[PDB]
Design a protein around this ligand. Structure first.
Ligand SMILES: [Cl-]
Ligand SMILES: [Cl-]
Ligand SMILES: [Cl-]
Length: 163
């Protein structure tokens, strides 16, 4: 059954795969998992560029809280439970497009840390971590706040206003 929530979920995990492998490539880890861009191109562009902007210009507001939640966990021990707990530590106070960008950016950070430790099977699972995490609260929030199209408009506004 194709319904709007399952559609949002399919888009979220396609996007998570694109973003994780793109982020890895920016540091020279070229996994070659994908044959093509999996999410819609405009959305893939939007998430990659928003994550980059947040890493460069909004790191301590959006990304540091997730990293700090994981302080003292080695890359060898990073797992989906850690990932969920860190995300919970922010989303417990609310959901926003900026916090969703932070979740994807942080998944990239975790992927990079695992790739540097050679934990290949963990890296390739991180897109599923995002998909599974979003089922309980993020996915219905996205549905109620305009779908991924609303993220595109948000991203266009933010990216057009930063230079
Ligand atoms: Cl529907
Ligand atoms: Cl790839
Ligand atoms: Cl809200």
């Amino acid at each position: 059954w194709d319904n709007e929530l399952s559609g949002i979920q399919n888009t979220s995990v396609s996007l998570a795969a694109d973003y994780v492998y793109m982020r890895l490539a920016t540091e020279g880890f070229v996994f070659g998992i994908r044959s093509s861009v999996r999410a819609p191109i405009r959305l893939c562009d939007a998430m990659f560029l928003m994550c980059d902007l947040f890493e460069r210009k909004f790191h301590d507001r959006y990304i540091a809280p997730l990293k700090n939640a994981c302080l003292g966990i080695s890359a060898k021990d990073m797992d989906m439970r850690m990932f969920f707990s860190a995300l919970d530590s922010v989303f417990s106070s609310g959901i926003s497009w900026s916090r969703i960008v932070a979740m994807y950016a942080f998944a990239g950070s975790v992927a990079l840390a695992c790739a540097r430790q050679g934990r290949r099977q963990t890296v390739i699972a991180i897109p599923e971590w995002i998909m599974l995490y979003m089922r309980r609260a993020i996915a219905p929030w996205i549905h109620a706040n305009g779908g991924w199209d609303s993220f595109i408009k948000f991203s266009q506004d933010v990216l057009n206003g930063n230079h």
